[PDB]
Amino acid sequence: TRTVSEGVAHIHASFNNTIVTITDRQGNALAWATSGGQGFRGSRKSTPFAAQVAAEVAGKAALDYGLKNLDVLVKGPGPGRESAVRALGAVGYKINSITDVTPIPHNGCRPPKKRRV
Amino acid sequence: MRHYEIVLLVHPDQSDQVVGMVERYISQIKEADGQIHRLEDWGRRQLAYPINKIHKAHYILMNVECGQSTLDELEELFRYNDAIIRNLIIRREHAITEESLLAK
Amino acid sequence: IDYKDIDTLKQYITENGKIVPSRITGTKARYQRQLALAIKQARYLSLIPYTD
Amino acid sequence: PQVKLKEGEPVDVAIRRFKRSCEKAGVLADVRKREFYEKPTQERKRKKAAAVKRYQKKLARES
Amino acid sequence: ALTNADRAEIIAKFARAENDTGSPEVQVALLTAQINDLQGHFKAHKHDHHSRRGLIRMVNQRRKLLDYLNGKDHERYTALIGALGLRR
RNA sequence: AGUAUGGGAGAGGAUGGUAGAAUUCCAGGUGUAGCGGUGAAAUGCGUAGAGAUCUGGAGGAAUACCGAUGGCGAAGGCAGCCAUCUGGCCUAAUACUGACGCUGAGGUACGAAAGCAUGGGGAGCAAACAGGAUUAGAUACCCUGGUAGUCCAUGCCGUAAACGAUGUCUACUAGCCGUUGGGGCCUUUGAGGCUUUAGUGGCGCAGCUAACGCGAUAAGUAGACCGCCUGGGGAGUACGGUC
Ligand SMILES: [Mg+2]
Ligand SMILES: [Mg+2]
Ligand SMILES: [Mg+2]
Ligand SMILES: [Mg+2]
Ligand SMILES: [Mg+2]
Ligand SMILES: [Mg+2]
Ligand SMILES: [Mg+2]
Ligand SMILES: [Mg+2]
């Protein structure tokens, strides 16, 4: 029902999974997709293929709101980081800019122990 | 006595009363004895990042030469004055009178 | 260097706001130390951004 | 960061520019570093090894 | 914290000869004044071991200088200890 | 060997204040099928609305970039910024005391982390513990949670591969290349080139060494004092004593 022309895509790329969510400015959510919910369950989840699958699904879901110019914010490591933006651009959005918003502590909390594997 | 440099950020809304507060500070310093070596008002500035949910700040600079008691008094005055956010007090040797950059 | 010389302070800061290493610029050791102190003072005084 | 698109910039070229900017920034390096906690002794060991290696590199280049 | 004026006053009071700044009497007077002054600081900063090391260094130098003066002449040592209010 | 006066660099020590990033938790806005994790799984979390995104709050701990074969400290060890108190070191010219020195059995002071006593605090991490995997077995390595502890105040404990595995002080014996804090001289195109001093590194002659190697920061050539050793186990153990 509600129509918004401007939107923002958040891409939570990580070692195990990638999550795509479309939010109108002020951060209210419209649509979202994940790799795990689109097959590729297991080691396949982290591949960029699942990332682009999720990105296209989220974009197609979000087209209903009639938004054509999109801002992109990226945080975290992991494959599929660029596949998501490629898929979003392919869907037809106008990507205004891509920025890295991954958090960085200035020596805060103690990280977990190293794994003896 | 020693030499001190004071930078004060004042809330933009209460920028009208800045002349009065600084005048009171100078009067107190002179009453103690002291020496006012430098004084400027940089005006209001756009903050690099928000401080206490505010985006603008009035800026005042002073070089004074006073004693420990006067310094301590200035300290709690700045602490308790709500108009003053973000005060800073640096120690210096010698008095610098030359006009500062960023004056206007 | 003083915290009030914002132009030179920015001349040694990267776009993200991080301080540029001395090796890249050729600055001397003591000059680099005073530069870092001045940049930190300016960051406190909200004359230059901490990050971003 | 803050890679604003031009009027006709292709998405692939924009992504390449974003990759280059991120690589120059070194953001991924900190995230990798903080994944696990490393002992102070190991940190000093790594720094000393790096010091030796770069001194040897400088000597080799000078030679 | 002693000032230049205070140190000059001590030097003038205990100087045997004009411009005398290295005599045992002057050295011991200065060290005694410094040691007495630092007691107030060490009353409020009892866990300042790094500074207490220097305080002990001053104490040891004063002991050595007093022993040397006593060895060379007893009258000067007795007068110095009487003036500076030191047991030994 | 020491003293007075002018300057310099420094995460040297104690007390208090304060800034920004981040994790956790608590509410609310949007939104609805997963999230988390592994080599692969599973435990666990979530339709009583999780994860993601936005806003507002609570609290604890540590200070990205600078950062360096860099700096300071007797050793242990010291990192955001500001104020107060405070120890040492470096450097220059004058002016003083006149061997006032070196070492040190006993003795005494300080002394990582863990641990102990009293009171407080507790975000993250995490001995013990619980469950899930792997295995013939799994008291483990991997995963999910998690207590003491790690934090503050006042005391105790005296131990580490507390290592350069190299006790302190002193004089002398080719050279070459870096770097940190000072002093001196000479050029100019505004920063450089030579010296010298005190630290900190890389090669290397002679000399030494079983060899590896050390080589003005000696493990070379000499002097002063102290501590230590006498085949491997039994054993840094028993008995007695002190704490
Ligand atoms: Mg884990
Ligand atoms: Mg305390
Ligand atoms: Mg002994
Ligand atoms: Mg003790
Ligand atoms: Mg032992
Ligand atoms: Mg050690
Ligand atoms: Mg040993
Ligand atoms: Mg025993």
XYZ file of C-alpha atoms (C1' of nucleotides) and ligand atoms in Angstrom:
675
model
C 0.000 0.000 0.000
C 2.483 2.614 1.186
C 4.837 3.821 -1.552
C 8.349 5.137 -0.869
C 10.732 6.253 -3.608
C 13.971 6.196 -1.577
C 15.321 3.153 0.244
C 18.405 1.676 1.886
C 19.700 -1.889 1.595
C 21.594 -3.369 4.555
C 23.824 -6.369 3.824
C 24.994 -8.276 6.920
C 27.641 -10.421 5.258
C 29.243 -12.909 7.644
C 31.376 -16.039 7.570
C 28.399 -18.413 7.810
C 25.523 -16.371 6.372
C 24.466 -13.208 4.556
C 21.289 -11.251 5.338
C 19.685 -8.592 3.129
C 17.078 -6.142 4.425
C 15.415 -3.200 2.661
C 14.468 -0.274 4.897
C 12.992 3.102 4.056
C 15.026 6.004 5.407
C 14.652 6.298 9.182
C 15.316 2.560 9.097
C 11.780 1.143 8.977
C 11.884 -2.313 7.400
C 10.041 -3.232 4.192
C 11.466 -6.562 2.987
C 14.285 -8.956 3.822
C 15.852 -12.188 2.588
C 18.489 -14.646 3.798
C 20.611 -17.367 2.234
C 19.513 -20.034 4.711
C 15.846 -19.575 3.842
C 16.546 -19.933 0.106
C 18.166 -23.369 0.146
C 21.921 -23.876 0.213
C 21.662 -25.135 3.794
C 25.062 -26.237 5.094
C 28.467 -25.254 3.776
C 26.704 -23.906 0.681
C 25.178 -21.110 2.776
C 28.317 -18.950 2.733
C 28.875 -19.026 -1.039
C 28.211 -15.794 -2.979
C 25.628 -17.714 -5.026
C 23.325 -17.841 -2.015
C 24.080 -14.157 -1.434
C 22.932 -13.131 -4.912
C 19.908 -15.436 -4.649
C 18.860 -13.714 -1.423
C 19.581 -10.279 -2.887
C 17.394 -10.884 -5.944
C 14.586 -12.333 -3.824
C 14.642 -9.346 -1.463
C 14.742 -6.890 -4.360
C 11.826 -8.542 -6.138
C 9.860 -8.478 -2.885
C 10.691 -4.786 -2.400
C 9.707 -3.688 -5.927
C 6.051 -3.694 -4.824
C 6.669 -0.430 -2.945
C 7.859 1.401 -6.071
C 11.327 2.456 -4.910
C 13.857 2.989 -7.698
C 16.922 4.659 -6.110
C 18.713 2.630 -3.441
C 21.504 3.293 -0.964
C 23.688 0.372 0.115
C 25.338 -0.159 3.510
C 27.677 -3.115 4.068
C 29.025 -4.549 7.323
C 31.024 -7.637 8.180
C 33.289 -10.067 6.333
C 32.382 -13.139 4.306
C 31.752 -14.201 0.710
C 28.789 -12.790 -1.158
C 29.573 -9.227 -0.075
C 29.762 -7.975 -3.669
C 27.321 -10.506 -5.122
C 24.492 -8.845 -3.197
C 25.208 -5.416 -4.683
C 25.623 -6.938 -8.147
C 22.219 -8.619 -7.854
C 20.584 -5.441 -6.542
C 21.999 -3.464 -9.461
C 20.826 -6.131 -11.898
C 17.293 -6.028 -10.474
C 17.027 -2.441 -11.760
C 17.781 -0.238 -8.738
C 19.920 2.880 -9.023
C 22.714 2.341 -6.491
C 23.508 5.762 -5.041
C 26.585 4.658 -3.086
C 28.165 1.722 -1.263
C 29.683 2.270 2.184
C 31.310 0.055 4.808
C 29.721 0.395 8.251
C 31.317 -2.612 9.946
C 31.919 -1.841 13.649
C 35.450 -1.514 15.017
C 36.118 -1.397 18.786
C 38.991 0.678 20.141
C 40.160 -2.178 22.375
C 36.944 -2.800 24.298
C 35.870 -6.303 25.347
C 38.156 -9.339 25.433
C 37.741 -11.530 22.309
C 37.204 -15.288 22.701
C 40.074 -17.747 22.938
C 41.928 -18.983 19.870
C 40.772 -22.400 18.668
C 43.224 -25.309 18.919
C 42.130 -27.110 15.765
C 51.313 31.618 39.891
C 51.115 29.664 36.627
C 49.800 30.030 33.081
C 46.628 28.310 31.878
C 44.696 28.153 28.611
C 40.936 27.556 28.776
C 38.658 26.545 25.896
C 34.920 26.628 26.588
C 31.995 25.352 24.532
C 28.730 27.107 25.390
C 25.286 25.915 24.373
C 24.150 27.880 21.289
C 20.797 28.906 22.790
C 22.444 30.684 25.746
C 25.061 32.415 23.579
C 23.499 35.782 24.449
C 24.735 35.666 28.061
C 28.328 34.683 27.230
C 29.571 38.263 27.600
C 28.251 38.350 31.162
C 29.797 35.055 32.277
C 33.216 35.893 30.849
C 33.024 39.326 32.463
C 32.309 37.687 35.823
C 35.248 35.323 35.344
C 37.597 38.206 34.520
C 36.312 40.137 37.535
C 36.991 37.164 39.816
C 40.487 36.668 38.384
C 41.305 40.354 38.861
C 39.910 40.289 42.405
C 42.218 37.386 43.239
C 45.065 39.190 41.390
C 45.949 37.159 38.322
C 46.547 38.310 34.758
C 44.326 37.956 31.690
C 46.798 37.441 28.858
C 44.469 36.437 26.004
C 40.734 36.462 25.234
C 38.780 35.658 22.069
C 35.299 34.525 21.084
C 35.287 32.349 17.964
C 31.506 32.573 17.588
C 29.209 29.651 16.989
C 30.492 26.647 15.073
C 29.123 23.483 13.520
C 30.251 20.619 15.731
C 32.322 17.901 14.093
C 30.092 15.412 15.931
C 27.039 15.959 18.155
C 27.670 16.654 21.842
C 24.726 16.093 24.197
C 22.301 15.959 21.232
C 23.399 19.401 19.962
C 25.059 20.217 16.636
C 26.253 23.803 17.241
C 28.433 25.373 19.905
C 29.737 28.798 20.891
C 33.515 28.808 21.370
C 35.547 30.930 23.805
C 39.327 31.016 24.358
C 41.268 32.467 27.297
C 44.858 32.643 28.498
C 45.002 33.437 32.217
C 47.765 33.495 34.826
C 46.484 32.735 38.321
C 46.948 30.597 41.412
C 45.838 27.139 42.473
C 42.812 28.328 44.456
C 41.578 30.480 41.574
C 42.097 27.583 39.163
C 40.109 25.226 41.381
C 37.318 27.804 41.679
C 37.162 28.203 37.900
C 36.949 24.416 37.704
C 33.831 23.908 39.808
C 32.233 26.991 38.257
C 32.641 25.434 34.811
C 31.475 22.072 36.166
C 28.254 23.414 37.669
C 27.379 25.891 34.919
C 24.978 24.108 32.576
C 25.595 26.633 29.791
C 29.204 25.386 29.671
C 29.558 22.018 27.957
C 33.009 20.723 27.055
C 35.513 22.884 28.926
C 39.235 22.140 28.599
C 42.181 23.467 30.627
C 45.760 23.147 29.369
C 48.893 24.024 31.343
C 51.414 26.372 29.727
C 54.699 28.094 30.503
C 55.119 31.756 29.529
C 52.246 33.992 28.393
C 51.350 34.069 24.693
C 49.693 37.284 23.503
C 49.822 36.873 19.713
C 46.473 36.588 17.956
C 45.465 32.960 17.480
C 44.469 31.228 14.279
C 40.752 30.468 13.856
C 39.981 33.835 15.478
C 37.570 34.716 12.662
C 51.884 22.044 16.258
C 48.821 23.153 18.209
C 45.296 21.768 18.328
C 44.080 25.010 16.729
C 45.894 24.538 13.379
C 43.109 22.481 11.855
C 44.475 22.714 8.308
C 47.801 21.052 9.104
C 45.998 18.644 11.423
C 43.845 17.502 8.491
C 46.918 17.335 6.249
C 48.018 14.251 8.247
C 44.645 12.467 8.628
C 43.135 9.905 6.274
C 39.598 10.119 4.919
C 38.303 7.720 7.578
C 39.844 10.020 10.201
C 42.818 7.825 11.098
C 46.249 9.328 11.743
C 48.685 8.765 8.873
C 51.827 6.785 9.823
C 55.104 8.690 9.939
C 56.760 6.383 7.397
C 54.362 7.335 4.596
C 54.834 11.089 5.052
C 58.481 11.381 6.121
C 57.769 13.365 9.291
C 60.293 13.204 12.118
C 59.684 11.371 15.386
C 59.153 14.323 17.736
C 57.100 16.163 15.128
C 54.909 13.065 14.777
C 54.459 12.824 18.551
C 53.353 16.454 18.906
C 51.142 15.983 15.840
C 49.374 13.029 17.462
C 48.890 14.921 20.727
C 47.429 17.917 18.877
C 45.089 15.709 16.844
C 43.814 14.034 20.014
C 43.236 17.412 21.674
C 41.312 18.626 18.616
C 39.211 15.447 18.615
C 38.334 16.125 22.252
C 37.436 19.739 21.449
C 35.260 18.523 18.550
C 37.210 20.494 15.962
C 37.879 17.357 13.891
C 35.870 14.136 13.741
C 36.938 11.122 15.771
C 36.053 8.738 12.929
C 33.884 8.413 9.825
C 34.077 4.427 1.775
C 31.574 7.059 0.598
C 31.932 5.932 -3.018
C 29.320 8.142 -4.667
C 28.221 6.903 -8.079
C 28.753 9.091 -11.121
C 26.005 9.796 -13.640
C 27.040 6.922 -15.924
C 29.331 4.832 -13.721
C 28.790 1.088 -14.310
C 27.905 -0.990 -11.269
C 30.872 -3.308 -11.837
C 33.343 -0.412 -11.969
C 31.745 1.105 -8.868
C 32.155 -2.216 -7.046
C 35.794 -2.362 -8.148
C 36.353 1.156 -6.802
C 34.667 0.210 -3.520
C 36.906 -2.852 -3.224
C 40.003 -0.737 -3.839
C 38.940 1.877 -1.277
C 38.220 -0.798 1.336
C 41.562 -2.491 0.648
C 43.378 0.825 1.074
C 41.474 1.500 4.302
C 42.286 -1.939 5.711
C 38.908 -2.386 7.416
C 38.822 -6.159 6.900
C 42.215 -6.521 8.592
C 40.944 -5.282 11.966
C 37.902 -7.566 11.829
C 40.168 -10.529 11.090
C 42.572 -9.503 13.862
C 39.867 -9.270 16.527
C 38.299 -12.675 15.790
C 40.305 -14.248 18.633
C 42.331 -12.963 21.578
C 46.103 -13.316 21.186
C 48.582 -13.450 24.048
C 50.856 -10.448 24.711
C 53.924 -12.664 24.313
C 52.731 -13.811 20.882
C 52.055 -10.197 19.888
C 55.608 -9.160 20.788
C 56.958 -12.213 18.959
C 55.102 -11.268 15.778
C 56.255 -7.654 15.974
C 59.888 -8.679 16.484
C 59.703 -11.104 13.556
C 58.235 -8.336 11.397
C 61.007 -5.974 12.491
C 63.686 -8.485 11.516
C 62.012 -9.222 8.192
C 61.692 -5.588 7.155
C 65.277 -4.827 8.190
C 66.433 -7.751 6.045
C 64.280 -6.493 3.164
C 65.809 -3.019 3.442
C 69.330 -4.465 3.493
C 68.585 -6.627 0.449
C 67.204 -3.650 -1.475
C 70.198 -1.488 -0.530
C 72.647 -4.200 -1.625
C 58.820 21.874 47.141
C 61.849 24.046 47.857
C 62.425 27.055 45.620
C 65.626 28.571 44.280
C 65.320 31.304 46.909
C 64.990 28.766 49.730
C 68.005 26.803 48.504
C 69.990 30.044 48.210
C 69.014 30.925 51.780
C 70.223 27.542 53.046
C 73.465 27.935 51.086
C 74.039 31.401 52.541
C 73.332 30.184 56.074
C 75.702 27.203 55.894
C 78.426 28.391 53.484
C 81.898 28.317 55.031
C 83.504 30.344 52.226
C 82.225 32.784 49.628
C 80.607 30.990 46.654
C 80.850 27.687 48.572
C 78.287 25.248 47.158
C 80.090 21.901 47.449
C 81.079 21.804 51.105
C 79.806 18.922 53.266
C 77.892 21.342 55.492
C 75.985 22.919 52.599
C 75.321 19.552 50.955
C 73.987 18.033 54.181
C 71.830 21.090 54.894
C 70.253 20.904 51.434
C 69.668 17.155 51.719
C 68.109 17.546 55.171
C 65.739 20.236 53.908
C 64.697 18.112 50.918
C 64.153 15.010 53.066
C 62.048 16.978 55.552
C 59.977 18.469 52.731
C 59.213 15.110 51.114
C 57.637 13.706 54.302
C 54.386 15.527 53.576
C 54.202 14.102 50.062
C 54.957 10.600 51.337
C 52.238 10.925 53.989
C 49.529 11.170 51.300
C 51.138 8.874 48.672
C 52.362 5.963 50.800
C 52.384 3.648 47.756
C 54.875 5.795 45.782
C 57.701 3.274 46.018
C 59.474 4.688 42.964
C 59.862 8.079 44.672
C 60.670 6.523 48.048
C 63.685 4.943 46.350
C 65.067 8.402 45.580
C 64.277 9.544 49.110
C 66.338 6.637 50.459
C 69.132 7.561 48.049
C 69.213 11.067 49.543
C 69.250 9.597 53.058
C 72.219 7.370 52.204
C 74.197 10.236 50.670
C 73.588 12.358 53.767
C 74.793 9.508 55.986
C 77.976 9.111 53.941
C 78.737 12.845 53.939
C 78.188 13.060 57.700
C 80.523 10.112 58.274
C 83.201 11.738 56.103
C 82.909 15.059 57.942
C 83.082 13.322 61.319
C 86.192 11.461 60.200
C 87.958 14.608 59.020
C 87.040 16.813 61.999
C 84.807 16.282 65.020
C 84.040 19.926 65.836
C 82.522 20.644 62.421
C 80.453 17.457 62.646
C 79.170 18.337 66.121
C 78.249 21.880 65.080
C 76.556 20.643 61.901
C 74.446 18.059 63.730
C 73.539 20.607 66.399
C 72.439 23.121 63.771
C 70.509 20.641 61.614
C 68.840 18.909 64.565
C 70.087 15.437 63.661
C 70.707 12.639 66.142
C 73.765 11.422 64.228
C 83.184 10.844 43.330
C 79.850 14.653 44.654
C 77.291 20.083 44.938
C 74.669 25.341 42.732
C 72.871 27.736 38.608
C 70.329 27.489 32.444
C 67.777 24.147 29.153
C 65.715 19.066 26.932
C 63.022 14.089 25.944
C 60.211 10.456 28.106
C 53.320 4.402 28.341
C 58.812 6.593 35.281
C 55.315 6.596 40.050
C 50.604 8.217 43.134
C 45.586 10.813 43.247
C 41.262 12.708 40.828
C 38.376 14.114 36.577
C 36.700 13.422 31.725
C 36.029 11.925 25.972
C 34.886 8.491 21.740
C 34.291 3.555 19.495
C 32.425 -1.266 20.765
C 29.989 -5.811 23.457
C 25.892 -7.034 26.826
C 21.110 -6.052 28.816
C 16.087 -3.416 29.154
C 11.898 -0.968 26.525
C 9.472 0.830 22.097
C 8.928 1.580 16.151
C 8.924 -1.406 11.380
C 8.919 -6.519 9.654
C 8.064 -12.333 9.520
C 10.233 -17.150 8.789
C 14.248 -18.563 10.339
C 18.783 -17.508 13.539
C 23.182 -19.383 15.657
C 27.142 -22.891 15.035
C 30.568 -26.929 12.466
C 34.802 -30.512 8.621
C 29.448 -32.222 8.637
C 26.019 -32.111 12.435
C 23.675 -31.535 16.841
C 22.721 -28.864 21.786
C 20.757 -23.887 22.038
C 17.588 -19.259 20.471
C 12.659 -18.018 17.822
C 5.396 -17.567 15.684
C 4.355 -16.174 23.452
C 7.523 -12.854 17.124
C 13.581 -14.464 16.956
C 17.544 -12.776 13.566
C 18.053 -7.925 10.755
C 17.138 -2.231 11.003
C 15.825 2.386 13.914
C 15.133 5.150 18.466
C 15.746 5.872 23.847
C 17.964 4.196 28.413
C 21.421 1.035 32.407
C 26.095 -0.710 33.693
C 31.150 -2.758 33.625
C 35.906 -3.167 31.454
C 39.783 -1.693 27.995
C 41.930 2.633 25.135
C 41.823 1.536 17.208
C 44.649 4.556 14.036
C 49.639 7.278 15.914
C 53.026 2.536 17.092
C 58.603 2.149 15.448
C 65.177 -3.342 15.794
C 60.821 3.271 19.200
C 60.844 5.473 24.692
C 61.124 5.210 30.328
C 62.185 2.311 34.850
C 67.293 -1.150 39.632
C 64.288 -5.474 38.445
C 59.060 -6.887 38.294
C 57.000 -3.643 34.639
C 54.802 0.856 32.316
C 49.563 3.108 26.399
C 43.154 7.593 25.285
C 43.126 12.896 27.037
C 43.331 16.803 31.269
C 44.828 18.737 36.295
C 47.641 18.183 41.115
C 51.871 15.862 43.996
C 56.447 13.454 42.956
C 61.577 10.270 41.502
C 65.352 9.599 38.046
C 67.991 10.561 33.253
C 70.253 13.698 29.111
C 72.861 18.245 27.781
C 76.367 23.416 28.167
C 79.730 26.920 30.586
C 81.123 28.583 34.744
C 81.830 28.282 40.345
C 82.777 24.903 44.684
C 84.196 20.074 48.467
C 88.908 17.700 47.969
C 89.428 10.399 47.646
C 84.318 11.962 50.405
C 85.378 5.535 46.215
C 84.166 -0.009 44.488
C 82.112 -4.366 46.352
C 79.507 -6.556 49.932
C 78.790 -12.460 54.453
C 74.589 -11.317 57.865
C 70.196 -7.825 57.462
C 66.607 -5.147 54.983
C 63.264 -2.994 50.761
C 60.688 -4.008 46.307
C 59.035 -8.011 43.608
C 54.658 -11.057 36.936
C 50.523 -14.431 37.072
C 47.812 -17.630 39.958
C 46.253 -18.165 45.059
C 44.418 -16.372 50.477
C 41.349 -12.677 54.322
C 37.502 -8.430 54.760
C 33.960 -5.083 52.033
C 32.161 -3.683 47.177
C 31.491 -4.509 41.897
C 30.483 -7.690 37.811
C 29.737 -5.848 30.747
C 33.124 -9.388 28.028
C 36.128 -13.697 28.843
C 36.554 -17.908 31.578
C 39.356 -22.913 35.684
C 35.119 -26.237 38.024
C 30.579 -27.829 36.095
C 26.161 -29.238 32.584
C 24.579 -30.713 27.913
C 25.677 -31.682 22.259
C 29.169 -33.906 18.806
C 33.847 -37.227 17.348
C 35.803 -41.988 19.050
C 36.435 -48.884 20.250
C 36.546 -45.950 24.615
C 36.627 -39.158 25.147
C 37.125 -37.146 31.909
C 40.028 -34.060 26.246
C 40.988 -31.351 21.543
C 35.339 -29.026 18.436
C 30.138 -26.754 19.771
C 26.258 -24.588 23.197
C 25.786 -22.369 28.347
C 28.411 -21.328 32.699
C 30.660 -20.433 38.624
C 35.295 -18.868 41.121
C 38.591 -15.482 39.011
C 39.880 -11.563 36.102
C 37.861 -5.232 38.363
C 38.085 -1.490 43.009
C 39.849 -0.496 48.515
C 43.079 -2.414 52.663
C 46.537 -6.530 53.904
C 49.079 -11.307 53.112
C 51.601 -14.681 50.037
C 57.984 -14.299 47.917
C 57.085 -18.037 43.554
C 58.241 -17.993 37.230
C 62.194 -20.575 30.838
C 61.625 -13.741 37.241
C 66.303 -15.416 30.380
C 70.842 -12.015 27.299
C 69.978 -19.282 30.584
C 75.865 -13.993 30.236
C 76.773 -10.695 38.938
C 78.639 -5.486 40.025
C 82.535 -1.700 39.155
C 86.966 -0.128 36.336
C 90.955 0.913 32.089
C 92.617 -0.742 27.010
C 92.034 -3.414 21.596
C 90.704 -2.782 13.488
C 86.752 -1.092 10.805
C 81.517 -0.508 7.939
C 75.974 0.465 8.024
C 70.981 2.083 10.729
C 68.197 4.491 14.612
C 66.565 7.626 19.680
C 67.824 12.379 23.125
C 71.470 16.352 23.199
C 76.028 19.642 21.988
C 79.476 21.864 18.030
C 80.841 23.416 12.917
C 79.640 24.382 7.505
C 76.080 25.214 3.299
C 72.109 27.887 1.453
C 66.680 27.823 -1.068
C 64.845 25.987 3.784
C 66.173 21.751 4.456
C 70.766 19.396 4.269
C 76.609 17.647 5.009
C 80.326 16.552 8.775
C 81.725 15.657 13.826
C 81.213 14.382 19.331
C 78.328 12.467 23.691
C 74.717 8.969 26.215
C 71.326 4.769 24.803
C 69.426 0.951 21.175
C 70.411 -2.483 16.646
C 72.971 -5.261 11.957
C 77.870 -7.058 9.985
C 82.985 -7.848 10.910
C 89.615 -7.808 11.717
C 92.655 -9.513 15.606
C 91.844 -12.324 19.935
C 88.917 -16.284 22.397
C 85.916 -21.040 21.986
C 84.964 -28.640 22.114
C 81.937 -26.731 18.529
C 77.872 -23.536 17.811
C 79.440 -18.840 18.151
C 81.236 -13.777 20.986
C 83.694 -9.795 18.995
C 84.020 -1.523 22.287
C 76.386 -3.601 24.608
C 83.158 -9.413 24.588
C 82.096 -14.964 25.895
C 89.068 -10.490 23.941
C 93.326 -8.387 27.116
C 93.831 -7.067 32.833
C 92.402 -5.466 38.252
C 88.759 -5.421 43.075
C 84.648 -7.900 45.716
C 80.656 -11.193 46.148
C 77.422 -15.661 44.833
C 77.757 -20.545 42.965
C 79.786 -26.405 40.959
C 82.064 -31.152 41.718
C 78.719 -38.380 37.663
C 73.253 -39.736 36.819
C 68.972 -41.309 40.115
C 67.165 -41.182 45.410
C 65.964 -35.364 46.044
C 64.967 -29.361 46.572
C 62.921 -35.245 48.980
C 62.750 -37.056 54.680
C 63.968 -35.403 59.684
C 64.780 -30.751 62.728
C 64.101 -25.508 62.580
C 62.167 -20.402 60.900
C 58.351 -17.771 58.312
Mg 33.309 -20.242 19.128
Mg 43.805 4.177 43.836
Mg 72.831 -11.334 51.113
Mg 55.117 -6.572 49.694
Mg 64.333 -20.151 41.615
Mg 60.138 -10.726 32.334
Mg 68.945 -18.768 36.383
Mg 60.524 -28.755 50.983
